[PDB]
Amino acid sequence: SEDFVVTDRGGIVENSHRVHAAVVDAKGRLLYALGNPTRMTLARSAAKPAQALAILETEGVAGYGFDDADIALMCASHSSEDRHIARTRAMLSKIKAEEADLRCGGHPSLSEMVNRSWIKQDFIPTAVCSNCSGKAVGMLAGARAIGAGTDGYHLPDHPMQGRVKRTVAELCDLDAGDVEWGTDGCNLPTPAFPLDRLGRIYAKLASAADGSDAGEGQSTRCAALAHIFRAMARHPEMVAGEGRYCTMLMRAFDGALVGKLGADASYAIGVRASDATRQLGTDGALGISVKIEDGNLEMLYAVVTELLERLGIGSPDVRSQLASFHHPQRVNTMGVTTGGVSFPFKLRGS
Amino acid sequence: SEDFVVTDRGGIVENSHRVHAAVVDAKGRLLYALGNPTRMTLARSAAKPAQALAILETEGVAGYGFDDADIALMCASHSSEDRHIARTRAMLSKIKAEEADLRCGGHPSLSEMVNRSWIKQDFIPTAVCSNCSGKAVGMLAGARAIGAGTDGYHLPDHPMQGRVKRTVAELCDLDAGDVEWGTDGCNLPTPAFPLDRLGRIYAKLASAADGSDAGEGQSTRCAALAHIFRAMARHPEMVAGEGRYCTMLMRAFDGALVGKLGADASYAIGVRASDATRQLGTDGALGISVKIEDGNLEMLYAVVTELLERLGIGSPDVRSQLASFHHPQRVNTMGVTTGGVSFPFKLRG
Ligand SMILES: [Cl-]
Ligand SMILES: [Zn+2]
Ligand SMILES: [Zn+2]
Numbered sequence A: 001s002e003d004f005v006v007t008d009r010g011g012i013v014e015n016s017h018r019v020h021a022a023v024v025d026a027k028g029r030l031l032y033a034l035g036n037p038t039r040m041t042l043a044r045s046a047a048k049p050a051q052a053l054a055i056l057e058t059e060g061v062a063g064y065g066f067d068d069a070d071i072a073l074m075c076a077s078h079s080s081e082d083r084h085i086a087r088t089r090a091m092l093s094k095i096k097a098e099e100a101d102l103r104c105g106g107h108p109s110l111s112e113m114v115n116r117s118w119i120k121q122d123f124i125p126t127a128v129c130s131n132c133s134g135k136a137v138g139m140l141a142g143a144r145a146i147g148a149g150t151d152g153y154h155l156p157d158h159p160m161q162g163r164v165k166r167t168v169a170e171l172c173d174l175d176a177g178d179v180e181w182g183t184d185g186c187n188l189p190t191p192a193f194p195l196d197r198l199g200r201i202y203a204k205l206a207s208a209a210d211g212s213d214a215g216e217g218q219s220t221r222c223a224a225l226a227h228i229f230r231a232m233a234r235h236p237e238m239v240a241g242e243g244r245y246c247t248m249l250m251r252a253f254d255g256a257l258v259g260k261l262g263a264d265a266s267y268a269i270g271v272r273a274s275d276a277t278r279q280l281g282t283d284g285a286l287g288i289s290v291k292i293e294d295g296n297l298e299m300l301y302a303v304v305t306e307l308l309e310r311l312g313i314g315s316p317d318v319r320s321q322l323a324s325f326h327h328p329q330r331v332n333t334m335g336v337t338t339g340g341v342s343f344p345f346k347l348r349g350s
Numbered sequence B: 001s002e003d004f005v006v007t008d009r010g011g012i013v014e015n016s017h018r019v020h021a022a023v024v025d026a027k028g029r030l031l032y033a034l035g036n037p038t039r040m041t042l043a044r045s046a047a048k049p050a051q052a053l054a055i056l057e058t059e060g061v062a063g064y065g066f067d068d069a070d071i072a073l074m075c076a077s078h079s080s081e082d083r084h085i086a087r088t089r090a091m092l093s094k095i096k097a098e099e100a101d102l103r104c105g106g107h108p109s110l111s112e113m114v115n116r117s118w119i120k121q122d123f124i125p126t127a128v129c130s131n132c133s134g135k136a137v138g139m140l141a142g143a144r145a146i147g148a149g150t151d152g153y154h155l156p157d158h159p160m161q162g163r164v165k166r167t168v169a170e171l172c173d174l175d176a177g178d179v180e181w182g183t184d185g186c187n188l189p190t191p192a193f194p195l196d197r198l199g200r201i202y203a204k205l206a207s208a209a210d211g212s213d214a215g216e217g218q219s220t221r222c223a224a225l226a227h228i229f230r231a232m233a234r235h236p237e238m239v240a241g242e243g244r245y246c247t248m249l250m251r252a253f254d255g256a257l258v259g260k261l262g263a264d265a266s267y268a269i270g271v272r273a274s275d276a277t278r279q280l281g282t283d284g285a286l287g288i289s290v291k292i293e294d295g296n297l298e299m300l301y302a303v304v305t306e307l308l309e310r311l312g313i314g315s316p317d318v319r320s321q322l323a324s325f326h327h328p329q330r331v332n333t334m335g336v337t338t339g340g341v342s343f344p345f346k347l348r349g
Helices: A044-056 A068-074 A082-094 A112-121 A133-145 A159-172 A195-213 A220-234 A245-253 A275-279 A297-311 A316-320 B044-056 B068-074 B082-094 B112-121 B133-146 B159-172 B195-213 B220-234 B245-253 B275-279 B297-310 B316-326
Strands: A004-009 A012-025 A030-034 A040-042 A180-183 A189-194 A257-262 A266-271 A286-292 A339-342 B004-009 B012-025 B030-034 B040-042 B180-183 B189-194 B257-262 B266-271 B286-292 B339-342
Touching: A004 A297, A012 A195, A012 A297, A012 B040, A040 A195, A040 B012, A044 A068, A044 A133, A044 A159, A044 A189, A044 A195, A044 A220, A044 A257, A044 A266, A068 A082, A068 A133, A068 A220, A082 A133, A112 B112, A133 A159, A159 A189, A159 A195, A189 A195, A195 A220, A195 A257, A195 A266, A195 A286, A220 A245, A220 A257, A245 A257, A245 A297, A245 A316, A257 A297, A266 A297, A286 A297, A297 A316, B004 B297, B012 B195, B012 B297, B040 B195, B044 B068, B044 B133, B044 B159, B044 B189, B044 B195, B044 B220, B044 B257, B044 B266, B068 B082, B068 B133, B068 B220, B082 B133, B133 B159, B159 B189, B159 B195, B189 B195, B195 B220, B195 B257, B195 B266, B195 B286, B220 B257, B245 B257, B245 B316, B257 B297, B266 B297, B286 B297, B297 B316
Parallel strands: none
Antiparallel strands: A004 A012, A004 A339, A012 A030, A012 A286, A040 A189, A180 A189, A257 A266, A266 A286, B004 B012, B004 B339, B012 B030, B012 B286, B040 B189, B180 B189, B257 B266, B266 B286
């Protein structure tokens, strides 16, 4: 319950960060934990697959012809690379909308390399550049498809947001009153719920992929969840971008899992059934959710990668692709290694 | 104890950050605390006034003619503004040295506005651009004055670093073995010691300033501490830069205190004796030191400003120049405020 990731300088403690984590089975039963696995947590962008489900289940959205890469962008916190802007624009054209219809705003890119190119060009990002631009187009598409107004598609009382709110609570297996709502950076409602339920959503994503693969009689919702999983795993560069953790993680695993960042250092992973998950004592898919209490992203990726190693998910060779995130560099202005990162926590079985 | 600073989104907890703080008198006695006031803590750049004391006490350094603004730069984590870089180069000429003699490296500017300008220009920062460049020149100056060699002035076995290590321990009133050492971003040794002792250093700085102003006879060390305090308070723009917390804090207080940032979210302040310090129960100067356990700088500045308010240091008018740091903006991409910062901590005496 007192689980930390700790950085040091010469073996002297620099910073410490409290970790919360839940590892759950396909029905949401808690298998392993760090910290408080039920911590009430703002899922932020890690809720995007659930919002994408609400979009995909909206009557008429199928008629726009969104493809897997478009769905991956709905699920993205992308780096605002030119390819992400181009896909956003292509999605707007599918619904006969324009950039002025977006209700999210521009921001500095999540990628330092993109941001430096923008600074060099004096480029001011606009709505089409938002990391949430794919979700925004999807919400616009849903509003248009049912003949709702589009001007306020992001407002809490709009029917698209009522659909989102209902869909999030159903995927979490929670009553409406057990999900709290704030406003996100992109100006949409954003949910908070117990951390283990974030893992449950991702377990359900990977379980649906397994059941699609196995040729089971799936509900339309399970079919849609399987589609979302497949889309993210097939187009992981749309979900984040070059050099980004989510993209590198999903590329290394080549369809065995999906992963997604939430702002302020949450992370979620859906893991398809494998020899590794069977060794962990479950017969189906699993979900992992993590929150770093103080919000540090570098520590989040270090911890997530350490957790994958402790859980035996992947091979050493596969996980070696994430080495730069697992043990972040601590090299000073003269090339000297001054410190490191340590994981003095123990996963508890529960 | 459970002392935190917390951010929320619509009243829903986002992040929480553990706070440690010590408020000490001029002899280091603990008056108030948050968290663990004796946490072993890397002082990082908050140690720079102690390193500047080691430089200024090196025999021969007075002959180079460093002025108060040069001393303030020795005490700095500057933003690498053109005035900082230029002063570093001017300081090198005072000691007949070149940039190739420095043993620190460049890095992206601590100021976003400066760094944006560098990106637009394809500027590559070099040693004189380091936020620690003034300290580096001072260490090189002391090595030149000693006469034993300058190539390794930054190495632990060099007499300049032996002087630094002894001086830090003496100011903390610690045995050498109770101060631990790592290596800083600039490649110099950097000390760790209990957090309250960082407060003690800054209490001694302010106390020396009080004695000097009152005309008391002082030891050579106290006279040098008073000089460091004066230099920081007279040239706060050299200590950090435009828009930076340390500069805005020291300007607002107009000589009543000095403050300094350490990397990974430590902060130290030395407060000259005043009605406010007397209300806190001490008859001399005060020191304050703070560490945010997880290293978040935005939260550090919010907590330091909140602590000054709780201690009654300044006036609402003086502290209001720090309002942007006290309650950081939480405005989204559409201009809407989405939450804020709160301070569920409780000072203990
Ligand atoms: Cl594409
Ligand atoms: Zn968003
Ligand atoms: Zn330094």
